[PDB]
Symmetry: C4
Subunit: 277 residues, 4 copies
């Protein structure tokens, strides 16, 4: 209705970063992932794999103590801030991060919001997902704040009922990105990426293989890692959404769309990303 | 003897569901898996992988507390109801599920039967396997009850000795599906799928690679997931049994039948299912 | 020197079992693996994978309590006898097994020998490896006892120094198989399989990729599983040793011999075994 | 500037060891890896996989008690010295090792230095990495001491600021290898391998896929294993650095350089090493 353009293959190709010969892990920064709780542990593994696959230099995972041992055998490249998401409720971060994500696998509690308020005093891009998404406003700060709601979460944030939202997705996503002054990645078929300066794009990739638990956790991690290796955080968000969907499309070439498990998106991304270089 | 027809490739092709572009995890429902105990933990991983591979939207695994950490690194897409199978002994479920399975890796105790009685007050299809199979009767309810005995379990349920059962498998499975008013998936070479309205089919797929611990746990999960994405639960049961056997047949093309491990059925299913689309 | 014959491809082909359409896990029996301790846990995973890959019907792993959780995510098809190897020191087994192995990852203690004495009152083939190998004698019983020493272990059992043993491997292995009335699988390049009735064979397969920790643990499991699916336990031992070596030979076609990890033998066996059918 | 030569493919080919038919795990020695702590557990898995992939006979991992269970399911071929890195602070090793590595995933503490001092009284090559790297001197001993700093660690060791170091890498690495009488593997693009007898080489392999957490942990393990199977420890160091980089180059043929995870280097090495035989 607003003729929102698609972020196309050519846009992805033009904006994906190089990984120069003369670079080291510091060049690509340290990200912080605040995710995973005792009854929702998996989201931390899913977002952690997503992030480390996506071009960062180092990853610190601030997860609940009992979730740590579940990540290590799969992702021994991550290090930990023990009970990090809980500790972030109590004080500003003393360490500097290139980008921060909070929420996958976290409960929708006031303590999580206290951690959000603390993380937002850092000077870096911050992603809020899942349990960190609430009806609230956001402080003026330098770095972008990126919200990644599915339509149910968007209802929670805005009071716009899902059946109404789905009739005018880009109109609502844009209106709320403007009002909140946050980026909004409104998930679904033709995911909307709405920027608070009024730029808006639709994502052309993806399919129903993604319509299963965990896929958004992987996405959150992909955005996190891409924020570390892209100079322009807009490109990081857009490329992450695009490549996430493209991994599902590769899967369905030889596998049924009913059978994908989220973590496999991370396994597919290395070859998919290569195709866009 | 009763000329029971085979559920054929063409039946599978005609009844497997689509996964539409305009769908999300809610479209494919949330299943509940009540499985896995401290000395039989593996069944929960096997049924959990089977279920998430088979087209559901979300999976909640109600397993013993100490089994949880053993599933997460392999299946980070599942969430948990801590000690769920034990808690189900005490009260009706307050959450709504698209389908429920109970029994793989559970002991054959009265407490498991109490959980069965509670789960049966939900309005959804329910699968009973392994430890949940007992000599008993079933309350009138809307959703189908699907029993998945091997011949030893069928003896436990009915008093029909295995050596007699094996002479007239479909006759006994049909008689007991009618008497109990449950679906009976009577396992073995030429698995019988007997419906309580008198429909009955034989499964043409599978081989001796399946004659090893855990394969039925994987099957239970496959039925669970297929109940979530098929409109007709009869088709879900039939397709699950068929595709389970077909995965073993793919394995034996290049691998010895002596060497299959149950979890690999789940790894094979993505490509096998694609062939039937 | 004694012109001991090789167990050849044609011998393997002639003696490997079928896995009939009309069979179930009971047909292929339940094995018991008594293995793995707190500072040597890995041997239980290695022997467990080896066994379940090798044609048994069910596997019960009697391992230390804290080792259980380390096996489950890799081998969810196994079930457990909690602290089984320790409990076997106290009483005869009340359950019937098709075959038993004891020792991989167990300490060389008197308590392990007490478990050995108890396991030997069962009527089935029994394999002793690693910590279960000691200087001792064996009671008259129906089922074969199969010892799987490397030359260091053979010295421990016999007092024959390794440098002397290696000069006349088959002569010593035969002499001691006769004296003890046990099968002796004397490991190394050209493994000797000596039977207490005086039959003796050399194994023609294998290479230096096997000269690394854990490979014998995998072998012990392979023998265990093959004892369950072969009618003649001599063939089970011989085929296991042969196929174990053949998996290393397949590895070295495209991978360096320096780089094999024991568990990968188990991953290779499905395709290798197929070649001999 | 000093015209330091590259260690080339032809050098690697000429110096990689054989793995003879008549060999066993003792031929290739037992290594000790002192690595992994509660908030940095992954380094032990990464270095452990690296080491066992690289031609040793046995590996003992002296890691913190709670890290053990995280390694076993991935690397069941390793055995353990429980809390080994901590115990090494208290006394000389009573066991003989072919080579020792200390530091990956260890904190930069005085207790780690006490363990270093004890390990150095053994008569074998010793690698110091990560937490074991400090500003210090080294006792006269037979076996080489091999330091594996990245430029940040080199600053910690020497006071040479990174921006100055990077202008004259080989000059500084050589000067400090001479002064300390240690081997220095100065990491980065064109890694410098400086020997204390004044030999020095540059590594021609590798790319930005390596510029991510954990890759140096894998390298430390590769050096450790190669020290066990090479007669000349200089060749072991040089070959390890070379093959490590070559694995990254193989990865980038079909996968994006942004997406490599360190543990995958270990998965690639078997085929890469084969190419140089
Ligand atoms: N190749 C390199 N060149 C320059 N600095 C480096 C290099 N590798 C690591 N560093 C520095 O050391 C830090 C990493 O320390 P660590 O994570 O403790 O191993 C980086 O953030 C850089 O500041
Ligand atoms: N049918 C579909 N087509 C394309 N993308 C989808 C579809 N269903 C779900 N997704 C994506 O899967 C993810 C779901 O996020 P979440 O609900 O947080 O797991 C988002 O990236 C969605 O845009
Ligand atoms: N693409 C979508 N369109 C409409 N509703 C959705 C979509 N994705 C998620 N939801 C809603 O939110 C619920 C999932 O919430 P959660 O499992 O907490 O992430 C679903 O059951 C739906 O009711
Ligand atoms: N020989 C065989 N041919 C076909 N299917 C088999 C065979 N042996 C076992 N199965 C199947 O393997 C599963 C065994 O279930 P369970 O005993 O619960 O593990 C069922 O789906 C059986 O029908
Ligand atoms: N296809 C089958 N035909 C006959 N008996 C079976 C079959 N599958 C399982 N059983 C019996 O039930 C036992 C397995 O029980 P469980 O291990 O408790 O699932 C087997 O040892 C058999 O005695
Ligand atoms: N160089 C070699 N050639 C053939 N087989 C070997 C070689 N080195 C070791 N093995 C085998 O590897 C296993 C070692 O057993 P263990 O010492 O118990 O791990 C046995 O099956 C040996 O025969
Ligand atoms: N094929 C073989 N030939 C000679 N000695 C061996 C062989 N395999 C193992 N050993 C000896 O036994 C030791 C291994 O014992 P273990 O690690 O306890 O299994 C080796 O270090 C050797 O001294
Ligand atoms: N851009 C690059 N080119 C080649 N090697 C690299 C590059 N970045 C990092 N490395 C290597 O990756 C490892 C990093 O070690 P560490 O910082 O200890 O993880 C070392 O082997 C470095 O030489
Ligand atoms: Mg989500
Ligand atoms: Mg069963
Ligand atoms: Mg051994
Ligand atoms: Mg390092």
């Amino acid at each position: 209705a607003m003729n929102v353009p698609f972020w196309t293959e050519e846009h992805v190709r033009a904006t994906l970063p190089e990984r120069d010969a003369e670079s080291h892990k510091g060049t690509y920064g340290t990200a912080l992932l605040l995710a995973g709780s005792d009854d929702m542990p998996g989201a931390a593994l899913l977002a952690g794999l997503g992030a480390m696959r996506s071009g960062l230099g180092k990853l610190v995972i601030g997860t609940s103590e009992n979730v740590i041992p579940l990540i290590v055998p799969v992702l021994p490249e991550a290090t930990y801030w023990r009970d990090g998401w809980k500790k972030a409720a109590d004080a500003q971060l003393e360490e500097t991060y290139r980008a921060i994500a909070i929420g996958p696998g976290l409960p929708q509690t006031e303590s999580v919001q206290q951690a959000v308020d603390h993380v937002l005093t850092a000077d870096c891009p911050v992603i809020l997902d899942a349990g960190a998404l609430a009806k609230r406003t956001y402080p003026k700060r330098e770095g972008p704040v990126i919200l990644t709601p599915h339509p149910g979460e968007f209802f929670r944030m805005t009071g716009v009922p899902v059946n109404e939202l789905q009739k005018k997705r880009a109109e609502y996503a844009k209106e709320w990105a403007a009002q909140l002054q946050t980026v909004i990645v409104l998930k679904g078929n033709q995911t909307v990426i709405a920027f608070p300066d009024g730029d808006c794009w639709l994502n052309p990739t993806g399919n129903g293989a993604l319509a299963k638990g965990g896929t958004g956790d992987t996405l959150t991690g992909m955005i996190l890692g891409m924020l570390c290796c892209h100079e322009d955080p807009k490109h990081a968000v857009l490329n992450a959404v695009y490549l996430h969907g493209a991994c599902a499309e590769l899967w369905t070439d030889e596998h049924s769309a009913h059978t994908l498990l989220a973590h496999e998106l991370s396994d597919i991304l290395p070859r998919v990303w290569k195709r866009f270089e």
